[PDB]
Amino acid sequence: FXXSXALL
């Protein structure tokens, strides 16, 4: 969840 792990 919350995108790819780049930002979150």
Residue numbers in the entry: 1 to 8
Give the original sentences from the paper that presented this experimental model:
Novo29 is an eight-residue depsipeptide comprising a macrolactone ring and a linear tail.
Novo29 did not form crystals from any of the conditions tested. epi-Novo29 formed rod-shaped crystals from 2.8 M sodium acetate at pH 7.0. Further optimization in a 24-well plate format afforded long rectangular crystals suitable for X-ray diffraction from 2.8 M sodium acetate at pH 6.6. The asymmetric unit contains two molecules of epi-Novo29, which exhibit only minor differences in conformation. In the X-ray crystallographic structure, epi-Novo29 adopts an amphiphilic conformation, with the side chains of Phe1, d-Leu2, Leu7, and Leu8 creating a hydrophobic surface and the side chains of d-Lys3, Ser4, and (2R,3S)-hydroxyAsn5, as well as the N-terminal ammonium group, creating a hydrophilic surface. An intramolecular hydrogen bond between the main-chain NH group of Ala6 and the side chain OH group of Ser4 helps enforce this conformation.
